[PDB]
Amino acid sequence: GLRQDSNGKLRYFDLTTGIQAKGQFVTIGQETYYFSKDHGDAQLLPMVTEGHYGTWVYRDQNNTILKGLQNINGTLQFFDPYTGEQLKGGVAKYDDKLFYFESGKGNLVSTVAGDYQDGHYISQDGQTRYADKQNQLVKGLVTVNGALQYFDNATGNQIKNQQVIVDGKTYYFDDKGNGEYLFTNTLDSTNAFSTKNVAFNHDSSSFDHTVDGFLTADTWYRPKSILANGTTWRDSTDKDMRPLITVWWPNKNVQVNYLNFMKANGLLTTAAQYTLHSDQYDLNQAAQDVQVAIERRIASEHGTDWLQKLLFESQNNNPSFVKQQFIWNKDSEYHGGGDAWFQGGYLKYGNNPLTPTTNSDYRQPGNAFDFLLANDVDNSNPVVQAENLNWLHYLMNFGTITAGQDDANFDSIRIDAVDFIHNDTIQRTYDYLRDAYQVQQSEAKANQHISLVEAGLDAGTSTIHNDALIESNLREAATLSLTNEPGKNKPLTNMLQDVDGGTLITDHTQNSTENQATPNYSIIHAHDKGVQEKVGAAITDATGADWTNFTDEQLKAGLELFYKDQRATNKKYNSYNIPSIYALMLTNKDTVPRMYYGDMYQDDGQYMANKSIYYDALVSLMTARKSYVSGGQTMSVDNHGLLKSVRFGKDAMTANDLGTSATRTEGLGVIIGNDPKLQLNDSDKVTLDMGAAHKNQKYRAVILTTRDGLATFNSDQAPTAWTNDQGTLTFSNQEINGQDNTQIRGVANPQVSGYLAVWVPVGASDNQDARTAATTTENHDGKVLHSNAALDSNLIYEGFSNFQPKATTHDELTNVVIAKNADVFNNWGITSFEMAPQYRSSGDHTFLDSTIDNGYAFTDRYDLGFNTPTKYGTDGDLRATIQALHHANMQVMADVVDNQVYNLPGKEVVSATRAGVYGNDDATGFGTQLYVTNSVGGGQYQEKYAGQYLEALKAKYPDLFEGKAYDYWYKNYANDGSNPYYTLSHGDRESIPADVAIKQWSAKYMNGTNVLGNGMGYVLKDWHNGQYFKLD
């Protein structure tokens, strides 16, 4: 061990190997020594005990900042010789050599071979290498321009994206070759003591807390022999179980910490200080002394329950011993990053020869995105694709199946997170609807099953044949030009055309055609879009909580503030110009608008109890839409910055068309301003060109801007204005004919920040309906939907909000109120009622969705409220709602969530790598490891209904079970800064079976999971050679 030479100087020889320590540190008993690299001569580093960290620097009991190398509390640290700043993630020179200090705590962990700042990277043989000042290849572990790196010793190739062991330390090098220290390895005990700790055998009965035959950090085991009472070696009985981490450790960091943890909990008495620089022999020896105290205490306690608590459970509000270790906690999982959109990011499943039950031949994303949250479903898998059809069929026949109630079935779907599931499942979904409802035959069939997706033109399987509507760019455009406070709005010229990354959806300026635009829906808000983050902000502000987890009382208080703010003229959290934006949505041509519940009602009340301040204006616009809105469209922005939008009325596509007798009392004009300080000169005129069908005609207001808000009129009893002989209405800063609120001027109030007026022609009959019926004309162009008058005649209603409170009675339940109010929706002209997703919430609080239980986060996707209600009602309440809506002549939309499942309690082991939403591998210290995942479960109703309809579907619609070639649009981003562009890709979906049900999920049917925080080394292996422990 420690020897003196003939000169009296001390030298050190490794206890296990005999090798002399030169140019390295060693901890002996309680002292830490350095041994010179030349002669191997000892040098005491005096322990620094008393003092503190501050500013980072370290001071002594004398309030003095320390400098250079220091031995602080069993760690060696370095502090700049001048500034005294602590080094972390870098090298310092000592004894004319280089040592690396890890980035966490700044502990000295290793020697580095050289420091290079005067070389050049080069490529040779498609590798990167580095050539030093003398043009020589650099080898080994080095720093280059201040970055730890490693080059293969034989070739000089820079290692990238791998873990590497160098001199018994393990490091990770990223995608750019930049390195970080992970842990220090155990050198190795060989002794007779340890050979009695070896496992009795490798059978499953000798181990517990195992998963799929793998060992975990929590595993207890039966050894060959037990040192009873700390004195007598005996044979183990089947009832002798001891923890594996009392006799074995994955790395030196854990073994050192374990010994220290046992010192602090009074199971090991020594003045010896244990560090990363302690000799392995001594560490091993000390662990054996701990066994002694443990066995002695087991005998005393007649049991092992104290040991369980000591090692594996929290203590004095501290994490357990296990959860204090890097490889067994989230720190070794490297959460976060720009692509980690929710839940700290993802783990992508792979294959391993030892995990045959979780391996997969699929797991291709088949779309732009892959991961989002919770357990991501592998919708490329044929068996999954079949189970997607089964679930889809269940929802489209939900009343039939659950109660033999044929008028209680969903008619249409929303594909949630469409870009996050494989295109084959999306195309197959569309063939199902083709086969069941013949939507491709004619617009009559298509418009009875209006479906939509959560995406724009990027949903290429949805645009290629317009099987469903995509979202227009209205939301975004309006967010630039109208939603903002005074001074922060852009000009309204961006509202003239609806454009998605440079591609045109429709142009409002001079729209006189049909079947040209991409079938789309326009919105401003949705349960998620433009709401949850602004409500989140007000909760956080009013209380303190984070926007995805908080109490119902905190929620309440946040909403109190949210609505006081929504009702004010000046708005910190809320959108400006909401009525105006709706005005545009409800009058624009070539769109199906979708109204948002939360723009008409307030979540500080039960469902539909508390009207919003916008209620009356949005009613008046819906009402006018049905009565008046048809024909072509013009739009322009005048030199005062006012947007002028006109619809001509049925049968008139342009300002010059004379129309028909229907045209006279149809059409309307909209005038919008986003500037509340607008004032016109006395001589200025604002003109709306109503068209040749509307010469010399009396008009009346639907909306007028007042000082305090908006006046709304749902009959011809309203202020009036006349067109001239050309069909032009003319406004100015004066009242028309002595009528208040007919002037144009900027106003700032709770409902408008700028200006809004809507005018319609006088003299419409009480029953006037401007809408156009779909024809049974056969389509020939291969498109399902077509953007024309008939499709524009539709109107969608998104019938929920995330932040509705829980119902306190049956009559307060959402679905009960909906049913009771069915006629109201029809009166407003709603043709499609988009219901919330009706699946029972997992209730796990791991995301916003499972905290307010909106129905997006669920375990059992067939459970739509049986026995006990969801947030919205029971299964009986849901049937009653679907029936009421149908009887009030509306379709009802099922929100189809194929992307993920939550809270699967059953455990499995699968290979995992860190990954972002794109399905891209992240380059992290975690690397690729076997991982214990929460991947098995589902629930009663899945067990009951999954796979049950497949044989019947196969008999009835064989084509869906076959493979099939298909086309779709692919959105290409150009790196050169210009706009994205679309190319025609081809797909070939696989055939799929009808005879394998997914009664419960498991990992072989999943792409991955959100990070769980178990750590890179929770599944136990030998880190010297990388082999997993696996039982028989």
Ligand X SMILES: OC[C@H]1O[C@@H](O)[C@H](O)[C@@H](O)[C@@H]1O
Ligand Y SMILES: OC[C@H]1O[C@H](O)[C@H](O)[C@@H](O)[C@@H]1O
Query: Which residues make up each annotated binding site for Ca(2+)?
Result: 370, 376, 420, 899
- 899 is an interface residue for Ca ion by CB under 5 A: yes
Contact 588, 633 (CB under 8 A): yes
Residue ranges in 398-417 that form contacts with ligand X under rule CB under 6 A: 416-417
Q: Which residues, numbered 25-44, are part of the site for ligand X (CB under 6 A)?
A: 25-26
Helices (H), 845-901: 875-887
Tell me which of 221, 420, 576, 941 binds Ca ion, using CB under 5 A.
420
Residue 9 vs 176, nearer CB to ligand Y = 176
Rule CB under 6 A: is residue 176 a binding residue for ligand Y? yes
Tell which one of 60, 85, 208, 921 touches ligand X (CB under 6 A).
208
Provide the minimum distance between the beta carbon of 526 and ligand X in the complex, in angstroms, as a whole number.
7
The entry of ligand Y, ligand X, Ca ion, none that residue 102 binds, CB within 5 to 8 Å by partner kind:
ligand X
Q: CB-wise, 197 or 705, nearer to ligand X?
A: 197
Residues in contact with 1007: Cβ distance below 8 Å, sequence separation at least 6, in sequence order: 348, 349, 363, 365, 370, 371, 376, 377, 378, 919
Nearer to ligand Y, 117 or 639 (CB): 117
Q: d(Cα 753, Cα 426) in Å, to the nearest integer?
A: 42
Specify whether the CB–CB gap between 618 and 579 falls below 8 A. Answer: yes
Three-state secondary-structure class, residue 758: strand
Residues 115-154 that bind ligand Y (CB under 6 A): 121, 128
Q: What angle do CA 301, 306, 308 make, to 5 degrees?
A: 135
376 binds, among Ca ion, ligand X, ligand Y, none (CB under 5 to 8 A by kind): Ca ion
**Numbers of helices and strands, H then E, in the chain:** 20, 56
- Smallest gap from Cβ 160 to ligand Y, in A, equals 7
Residue 176 interacts with, from ligand X, ligand Y, Ca ion, none (CB under 5-8 Å by kind): ligand Y
Cα separations in angstroms, 985 against 377, 464, 525, 631: 24, 10, 32, 36
Cα 37 to Cα 4, 34, 381: the distances in Å are 17, 9, 59
Q: Mask 213-242, x = binds ligand X (CB under 6 A)?
A: -------x------------------xxx-
- Write the single-letter amino acid at 156: G
Smallest gap from residue 1018 Cβ to ligand X (A): 16
376 contacts Ca ion (rule: CB under 5 A): yes
CB of 123 to ligand Y, least distance (A): 9
128/367 with CB nearer ligand X: 367
Q: Which stretch binds ligand X (CB under 6 A): 301-309, 622-630, 707-715, 725-733?
A: 301-309
* Alpha-carbon dihedral sign for residues 294, 300, 303, 308: negative
Size of the site for ligand X (CB under 6 A): 66
Q: Does 187 bind ligand X (CB under 6 A)?
A: yes
Stretch binding ligand X (CB under 6 A), from 137-145, 379-387, 446-454, 736-744: 446-454
Q: Return binding residues.
A: 370, 376, 420, 899
| Residue 346 touching Ca ion (CB under 5 A) | no
Residue 177 makes contact with ligand Y by CB under 6 A: yes
Rounded distance between C-alpha atoms, residue 825 and residue 607, angstroms = 14
Q: β-strands 140-144, 115-116: how paired?
A: parallel
Q: Give the bridge partners for 3, in sequence order.
A: 11
The yes or no reply on residue 501 touching ligand X (CB under 6 A) is yes
Place of tokens 């375990």: 859
Look at residue 891 and give the partner it binds from ligand Y, Ca ion, ligand X, none, a contact being a CB closer than 5 to 8 Å depending on partner kind: ligand X
Q: What angle do CA 884, 888, 890 make, to 5 degrees?
A: 95
DSSP H helical ranges for 303-397? 305-312, 382-396
**Closest Cα partner for 668 from 689, 653, 642?**
689
Amino acid identity at 761: P
In angstroms, what is the minimal distance from the CB of 928 to ligand Y? 21
Provide the minimum distance between the beta carbon of 128 and ligand Y in the complex, in angstroms, as a whole number. 5
Quick one: what does residue 305 bind among ligand X, ligand Y, Ca ion, none, with the CB cut-off 5 to 8 Å set by partner type?
ligand X
**CB proximity list for 35: less than 8 A, separation 6 or greater:** 11, 12, 21, 22, 23, 24, 25, 26, 41, 42, 43
Smallest distance, ligand X to C-beta of residue 74, A: 13
To ligand X, the closest distance from the beta carbon of 267 in angstroms equals: 16
Rule CB under 6 A: say whether 456 interacts with ligand X. Answer: yes
Those residues whose C-beta lies under 8 Å from the C-beta of residue 460, and which sit 6 or more positions away, are: 423, 968, 969, 970, 971, 982, 985
181 in Cβ contact with 103 (< 8 Å): yes
699 binds Ca ion (CB under 5 A): no
Interaction of residue 831 with ligand X, rule CB under 6 A: yes
Give the tokens for residue 110: 């290793």
In angstroms, the CA 23 to CA 78 distance is 17
**Partner in contact with 121, chosen from ligand X, ligand Y, Ca ion, none, beta carbon below 5 to 8 Å by kind:** ligand Y
Residues forming contacts to ligand X in the complex (CB under 6 A) are 14, 21, 24-26, 102-104, 180-181, 187, 208-209, 220, 239-241, 277, 279-280, 298, 302-305, 308, 326, 331, 366-368, 372-373, 416-417, 423, 447-448, 454-456, 458, 460, 471, 473, 475-476, 500-501, 527-528, 774, 794, 831, 849, 856, 883-884, 887, 889-891, 899, 925, 970-971
Residues forming contacts to Ca ion in the complex (CB under 5 A) are 376, 420, 899
Residues forming contacts to ligand Y in the complex (CB under 6 A) are 121, 128, 158, 176-177
